[PDB]
Design a binder for this molecule. Structure first.
Ligand SMILES: Nc1nc2c(ncn2[C@@H]2O[C@H](COP(=O)(O)OP(=O)(O)OP(=O)(O)O)[C@@H](O)[C@H]2O)c(=O)[nH]1
Ligand SMILES: Nc1nc2c(ncn2[C@@H]2O[C@H](COP(=O)(O)OP(=O)(O)O)[C@@H](O)[C@H]2O)c(=O)[nH]1
Lengths: 128, 431, 430, 303
């Protein structure tokens, strides 16, 4: 068993930095926050709430969401978002949600990709 | 009627804040039980900048203590002036950050941060008008640096226009306390550059030097260093709390001191610091105050101003004094030391005068110098950070808290760009 | 709030626990009956409604004699009888006996009591596992217990104060065997392992205390003073508080490298006491002296990676700073190029309490230096040939096989110790 | 200056074949000033240098960990600068066919990379809200431009000037000085993220696109809003002026390369070769032909 760690230190995996189509869609959507770093910006769940409001303004409001770093508030945001997704029919997979709240590498990227699928007319981002 | 919200972070920040609040209550004639015992109208005239009147005669500091371990706050509460603080403003966790900026900023600081912001917002809305927030803490510690940077980012997001002042105790050059001080300082400076409007750098080794050479004390505990820091912290805002012949608030100081938004790091010093032996030998005059003010030994920063160039410098004097004396002194200082002052600014001095000197001193003066000397301090911190990061020593402890390796290099890049700006304006030539 | 659970496995673990708990009782004023005539004891003792304090400790052994000695001695009304766990058959210096056959039921009961203890703790700084690498009980049962703790409790910081065999002097014959096995086990479970050597502590007692016949009681008293200095920042307030969690952050650069040399200073008898100044700089120098190391491992061979200094008593930050600056300027003391600071200084205002009946003098100052340095690979190098020399003939191997082990276990342990040697060489090299 | 190059023909359709040599969509185009050779920067983690009149794959550079968003030629064609989503700006040598150097101070996707007119400094605008200048002889980020609260989507040096205009996702177009490191001017007016920005060859005019399709043209000297072309609801992507010409060719997500007159903001040609969208457009230095790259995984030659 040949290990790659530097004396037990496993360097964090390198993210694929989303996709141009998804990032440009997010930028074209008018959002208060900016996706500097996808992990940190999406872990709170406020930017995703803004996306969901921009696509369904009637039943997703910003006053219900709080840009708060605590696990309680992050869970509250993500669970109300999940309830709305269940009512609407959007997937919003729970494993991706949990990875996003825990800051797991790539979970926020996958969740943003899936949101881009669900919203931007099922436009699958081309990939090899 | 221009209020200031004080925040203390970490053990060092809490000790500094306790000493500062003791000093301010002494200045305003407030006993540890909160009652006023000053017998001076000017003391109560502007007490609302720092304190709020309770139901009775008690005055409570507008201070918020944050920490991840309760021991430091227990000590602060049991200190001589521990009872003035409102008990609800002690926001503490249960597991302290093991000198881990990641633990204090992402994992453990996140849960306590909403309680901290609840307290901060509750204190801020009570303010009629808000000058801003002042946060005292130490760079190079887990809870202090981490949660301080997190809270500063949050407060900047909530109140962008309000002033932000920071008293950061940068890890000392020669003798470092903890191993991970370069990591914590690197991660904290990156946040302070983007968020804090005004930042004052303190070094414990500069404090030891000044208390060994000027005060000539033999056994300087942390209390003496916190006392000097408290003296500067009071003297910066005494123009708000007391009438002044030429008064100047925090925003005026920031406007006159900060040429460009990122160049907001300052070294500070307090005068007159006299040894108990030489107190009778020294004569209290404006020239003597200026002489001690511009002495590099008086700077509470490790970096010495001789190596760099003074971009700007504010001098807040306290006492019944001649404006002609003060202005002439600062002009002669500039003319004599024009080599150390930036050429493309016609006047590098913001002179302010307050009519109420600190207790016991007929005269005093605080100095706030924005000079390119801080470049060498950041450069040294980077010289340690790069050496540690090349072999990624202790990096797993930050990684296990879930922060990217790219974040370290981003913070290093921000520090290097700041150093580059300081060098650029050090060697900038007019026309 | 700062509870730490103490585990003492094997004869050596229990015998150093006796000294440790006597020292804690003396320090906190707790009489041996159980109660004392605030809340600084909570780290080591849990108080009941009656006011009588019981330690949060567990005495684990497969032999009844050592535990019954505690049950019969003065500290019979202090400890919890069920927390004293006694086996029926000894492990007989067999790692397999202590890890596969006899240790199962004992470790199950041990985990039961450990759950009961941890349920009474609001916070939990970690576990202090005191065992003897080189014996079936300590090595095998201790390894099994550490594995179970890692599986169930998870990220709780386990500090293992292990005693490896001395370079030349020893008391057992299969000691290299079970030491290699237990080192294989604990390389991956304990968070910070503190090395201790009987030969080194004997030398310390002979040279500094002038004891021509040092014994296990003296060794245990020194170890108890060291652990008390280590935990002093949890129980007593002082400038520059250091924590169990901060040990790992300021001492462990990488997860595999967490073995630590320990050195106490001063070690002086009262007749030699008050005959030297005992300043902070001098006690720091003594702590950094190679003879003051409690492991027969010359630090001159290797390079220091980190050094946590724990100062007790009348110590001022100016003095710790001056002493550490002198240490940095010192040439014989050598640090790795990638750790410029390499120092974690922490002061405490509580002077080290003196045990009546001990040889240590009442000194107002003390230093406990725990260092991560690459020189520690030398002891593993010694055991790695002491092992293979016997393993070539497969001597005493039938004993270990009889209790359900395989030649593969010995091979894997030897290979992992070789890998640890290679890792130490690599961290030492540029 | 004082050199009029007439470029009237914009309604001419595709002349050369649709060169589909990239597996995924092509993100940007860079024309060699001397020879008619085009480097296409596609999001397949590779860039490809083609001789366009032949349509021949001269070279293929690979090594970017992520998709490549921007590419540019050094003056005299000594080297190629490629910025990608891997946050690394890479300088590649044509002669030795490998990456000369890599700069990783940027920690987010590199939206745009451009050279100086003299070429020794390279401006990289990235998602990290900053515009970093790289001194190639030094290999170090000498200066960083900050002041954009959203992503810096585009980056265009003013022709033969130290001024640099960056269009950011914060609905702003900021013109900076490289030598000083300051924001000389900030054009507002956009109601959406500014996808791209481009200067006229004379430097008199500056056109920036929006995500809603609006292309706004400012007078750099006058610092005033001259024109506001309103295209379809699809994003306007990237634009290019005609060399000494009055026609601005704007890409779109509608798949049509439109050509609006800068004088009046009136459509002149609408090339519909691309199936879905056009990422970028570029004029020939001689003005003979346009090249348009888009989501069709194909860069197509026009006129
Ligand atoms: N430092 C120190 N080491 C001790 C002391 N007592 C025993 N040891 C060491 O502990 C080792 C064996 O301990 P144990 O395994 O617990 O002995 P045991 O309780 O009979 O259990 P087994 O021998 O494994 O059957 C010996 O090699 C000794 O070197 C002590 O008081 N101090
Ligand atoms: N001036 C001053 N500095 C201190 C004091 N206590 C600690 N420090 C320094 O502050 C640095 C950071 O420690 P700190 O932030 O308080 O630890 P933390 O609370 O766990 O983050 C240490 O290196 C100490 O040297 C104090 O009371 N006064």
């Amino acid at each position: 068993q040949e290990d790659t760690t530097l004396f037990g230190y496993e360097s964090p995996p390198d993210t694929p930095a989303l996709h141009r189509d998804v990032l440009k869609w997010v930028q074209g959507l008018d959002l208060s926050q900016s996706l500097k770093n996808c992990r940190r910006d999406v872990a709170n769940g406020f930017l995703v709430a803004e996306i969901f409001s921009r696509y369904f303004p009637a039943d997703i409001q910003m006053h219900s969401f709080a840009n708060a770093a605590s696990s309680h508030f992050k869970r509250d945001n993500w669970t109300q978002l999940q309830a709305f997704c269940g009512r609407q029919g959007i997937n919003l997979p729970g494993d991706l949600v949990e990875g996003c709240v825990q800051g797991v590498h790539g979970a926020a990227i996958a969740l943003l990709e899936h949101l881009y699928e669900a919203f931007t007319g099922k436009k699958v981002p081309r990939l090899k | 009627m221009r209020e200031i919200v004080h925040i203390q972070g970490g053990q060092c920040g809490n000790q500094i804040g306790a000493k500062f609040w003791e000093v301010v209550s002494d200045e305003h004639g407030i006993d540890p039980t909160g009652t006023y015992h000053g017998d001076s109208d000017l003391q109560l005239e502007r007490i609302n900048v720092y304190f709020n009147e309770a139901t009775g005669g008690r005055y409570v500091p507008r201070a918020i203590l944050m920490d991840l371990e309760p021991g430091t706050m227990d000590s602060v509460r049991s200190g001589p002036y521990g009872q003035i603080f409102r008990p609800d403003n002690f926001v503490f966790g249960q597991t302290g950050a093991g000198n881990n900026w990641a633990k204090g900023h992402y994992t453990e600081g996140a849960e306590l941060i909403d309680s901290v912001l609840d307290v901060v917002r509750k204190e801020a809305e009570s303010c009629d008008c808000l000058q801003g927030f002042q946060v005292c803490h130490s760079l190079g510690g887990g809870t202090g640096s981490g949660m301080g940077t997190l809270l500063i980012s949050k407060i900047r997001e909530e109140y962008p226009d309000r002033m932000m002042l920071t008293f950061s105790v940068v890890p000392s050059p020669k003798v470092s306390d903890t191993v991970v001080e370069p990591y914590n300082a690197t991660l904290s400076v990156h946040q302070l550059v983007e968020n804090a409007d005004e930042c004052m750098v303190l070094d414990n080794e500069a404090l030891y030097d000044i208390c060994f050479r000027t005060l000539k004390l033999t056994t300087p505990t942390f209390g003496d260093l916190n006392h000097l820091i408290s003296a500067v912290m009071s003297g910066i805002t005494c123009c708000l709390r007391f009438p002044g012949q030429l008064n100047a608030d925090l925003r005026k100081l920031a406007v006159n001191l900060i040429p460009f938004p990122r160049l907001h790091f300052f070294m500070v010093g307090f005068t007159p610091l006299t040894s108990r032996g030489s107190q009778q030998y020294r004569a209290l005059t404006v020239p003597e105050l200026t002489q001690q003010m511009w002495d590099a030994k008086n700077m509470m920063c490790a970096a010495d101003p001789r190596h760099g160039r003074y971009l700007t410098a504010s001098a807040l004097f306290r006492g019944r004094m001649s404006t002609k004396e003060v202005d002439e002194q600062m002009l002669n200082v500039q003319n004599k030391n024009s080599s150390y002052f930036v050429e493309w600014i016609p006047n590098n001095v913001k002179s302010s005068v307050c009519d109420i000197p600190p207790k016991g001193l007929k005269m005093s003066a605080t100095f706030i110098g924005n000079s390119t000397a801080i470049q060498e301090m950041f450069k040294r911190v980077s010289e340690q950070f790069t050496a540690m990061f090349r072999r990624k020593a202790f990096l797993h402890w930050y990684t296990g808290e879930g922060m990217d390796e790219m974040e370290f290099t981003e913070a290093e890049s921000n520090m290097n760009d700041l150093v580059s700006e300081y060098q650029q304006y050090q060697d900038a030539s007019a026309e | 709030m700062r509870e730490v659970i103490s585990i003492h496995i094997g004869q050596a673990g229990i015998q150093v626990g006796n000294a440790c708990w006597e020292l804690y009782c003396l320090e906190h004023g707790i009489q041996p009956d159980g109660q004392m005539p605030d809340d600084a004891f909570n780290t080591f003792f849990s108080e009941t409604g009656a006011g009588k304090h019981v330690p949060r400790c567990i005495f684990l052994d497969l032999e009844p004699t050592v535990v019954d000695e505690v049950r019969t001695g003065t500290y019979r009304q202090l400890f919890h009888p069920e927390q004293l766990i006694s086996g029926k058959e000894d492990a007989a210096n067999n790692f397999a006996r202590g890890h596969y056959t006899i240790g199962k039921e004992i470790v199950d009961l041990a985990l039961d009591r450990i759950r009961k203890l941890a349920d009474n703790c609001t916070g939990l700084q970690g576990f202090l596992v005191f065992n003897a690498v080189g014996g079936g009980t300590g090595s095998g049962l201790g390894s099994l217990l550490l594995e179970r703790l890692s599986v169930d409790y998870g990220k709780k910081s386990k500090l293992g104060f292990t005693v490896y065999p001395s370079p030349q002097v020893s008391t057992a014959v299969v000691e290299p065997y079970n030491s290699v096995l237990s080192t294989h086990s604990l390389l991956e479970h304990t968070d910070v392992a503190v090395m201790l050597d009987n030969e080194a502590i004997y030398d310390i007692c002979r040279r500094s205390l002038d004891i021509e016949r040092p014994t296990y009681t003296n060794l245990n008293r020194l170890i108890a003073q060291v652990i008390s200095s280590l935990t002093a920042s949890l129980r007593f307030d002082g400038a520059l508080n250091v924590d169990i969690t901060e040990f790992q952050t300021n001492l462990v650069p990488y997860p595999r490298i967490h073995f630590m040399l320990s050195s106490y200073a001063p070690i002086i008898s009262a007749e030699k006491a008050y005959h030297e100044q005992l300043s902070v700089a001098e006690i720091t120098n003594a702590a950094f002296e190679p003879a003051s190391m409690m492991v027969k491992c010359d630090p001159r061979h290797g390079k220091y990676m980190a050094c946590c200094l724990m100062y007790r008593g009348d110590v001022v930050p100016k003095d710790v700073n001056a002493s550490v600056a002198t240490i940095k300027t010192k040439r014989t003391i050598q640090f790795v190029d990638w750790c410029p600071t390499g120092f974690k200084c922490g002061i405490n205002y509580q002077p080290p309490t003196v045990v009546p009946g001990g040889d240590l003098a009442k000194v107002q100052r003390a230093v406990c230096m725990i260092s991560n340095s690459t020189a520690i690979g030398e002891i593993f190098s010694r055991l790695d040939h002491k092992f293979d020399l016997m393993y070539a003939k497969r001597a005493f191997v039938h004993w270990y096989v009889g209790e359900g082990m395989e030649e593969g276990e010995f091979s894997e342990a030897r290979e992992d110790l070789a890998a640890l040697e290679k890792d130490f060489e690599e961290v030492g090299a540029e | 200056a004082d050199l009029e190059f007439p470029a009237a023909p914009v309604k001419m359709l595709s002349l050369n074949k649709t060169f589909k040599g990239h597996l995924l969509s092509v993100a940007n185009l860079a024309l060699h000033p001397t020879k008619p050779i085009l480097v296409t920067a596609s999001d397949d983690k590779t860039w490809k240098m083609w001789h366009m009149p032949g349509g021949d794959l001269i070279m293929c550079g690979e090594g970017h960990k992520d998709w490549v968003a921007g590419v540019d030629f050094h003056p005299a064609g000594t080297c190629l600068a490629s910025g990608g989503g891997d946050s690394a700006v890479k300088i590649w040598d044509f002669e030795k066919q490998r990456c000369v150097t890599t700069f990783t101070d940027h920690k987010q996707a590199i939206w745009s990379v451009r050279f100086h007119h003299l070429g020794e400094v390279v401006a990289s605008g990235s998602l990290d809200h900053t515009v970093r200048l790289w001194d190639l002889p030094a290999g170090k980020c000498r200066m960083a431009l900050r002041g954009h609260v959203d992503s810096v989507n585009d980056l265009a040096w003013q022709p033969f000037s130290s001024s640099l205009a960056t269009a950011s996702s914060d609905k702003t177009v900021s013109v900076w000085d490289a030598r000083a490191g300051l924001c000389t001017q900030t054009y507002y007016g956009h109601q959406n993220s500014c996808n791209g920005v481009s200067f006229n060859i004379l430097g008199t005019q500056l056109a920036s696109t929006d995500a809603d399709g609006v292309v706004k043209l400012w007078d750099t000297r006058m610092t005033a809003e001259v024109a506001t072309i309103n295209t379809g609801k699809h994003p306007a992507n990237k634009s290019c002026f005609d060399r000494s010409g009055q026609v601005l060719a704007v890409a779109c997500d509608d798949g049509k390369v439109k050509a609006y007159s800068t004088t009046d903001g009136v459509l002149q040609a609408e090339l519909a070769g691309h199936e879905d969208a056009v990422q970028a457009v570029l004029f020939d230095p001689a003005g003979q032909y346009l090249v348009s790259c888009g989501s069709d995984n194909t860069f197509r030659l026009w006129s």
